[PDB]
Amino acid sequence: KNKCVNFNFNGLTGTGVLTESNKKFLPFQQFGRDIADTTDAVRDPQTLEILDITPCSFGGVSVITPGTNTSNQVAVLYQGVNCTEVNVFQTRAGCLIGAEHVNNSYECDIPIGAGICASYQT
């Protein structure tokens, strides 16, 4: 549980994070599905439990760097995912590594998101 794995339950396969939830299935309905007709949850064929299936984390990878003439410094940004693998900080857009956090507000230069921008300064 609480890990990205390739799960096989009875004749059902898939890759995702298995997290036990409080959902209550009908005793005669073992596997559930969401409004999109994709399984969001399952019932352990052996033990009695309800496992919420959350697809494993994924998202775009963005590179924040100034101009080539300015400097070669790089700051990697992840989209829609927090810091996992891994100046490691977290924002509302995702994990941002390779940059320092400054409480002082400045004019936006390199846009990131959620009211946050990056720049090359002291």
Binding site: T13, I35, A36, D37, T38
Partner: protein
């Protein structure tokens, strides 16, 4: 002029709280995006003429050369379905950008300045406009004479 304005603003609060359909212009934007995303997902379940819509099934059942034939059918349809989604978003992107330009024009003329244009800032002679923030849009309160 004070009893008219103060009473007018009171009518805006009562009408805005009572009438939830006046904002349908914004609700439509959310609906169009929700329907486009929902449909975009549901197209993955269709087989697109293939023996099965699941890749693992055709790989674990049909022979290697037979699976390639089926994978081509699934990729072809899933590609076209994604092309349809993008095509619709670009078209709708022209509608939202057009409406945004109109909001920018009214913001400058009706709010920042005073415009003599007829029925651009609302019925009657335009006096002042007070903008208001709204999700995925903007609301303008136009004071007219």
């Amino acid at each position: 002029i004070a009893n008219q304005f103060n009473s007018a603003i009171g009518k805006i609060q009562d009408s805005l709280s009572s009438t939830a359909s006046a904002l349908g212009k914004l609700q439509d934007v959310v609906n169009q995006n929700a329907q486009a995303l929902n449909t975009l997902v549901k197209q993955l379940s269709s087989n697109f003429g293939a023996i099965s819509s699941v890749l693992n099934d055709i790989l674990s059942r049909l022979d290697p050369p037979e699976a390639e034939v089926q994978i081509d059918r699934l990729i072809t349809g899933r590609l076209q379905s994604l092309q349809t989604y993008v095509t619709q978003q670009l078209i709708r992107a022209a509608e939202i950008r057009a409406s945004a330009n109109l909001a920018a024009t009214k913001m400058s003329e009706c709010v920042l300045g005073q415009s003599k244009r007829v029925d651009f800032c609302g019925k009657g002679y335009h006096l002042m406009s007070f903008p208001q923030s709204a999700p995925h849009g903007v609301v303008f309160l136009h004071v007219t004479y």
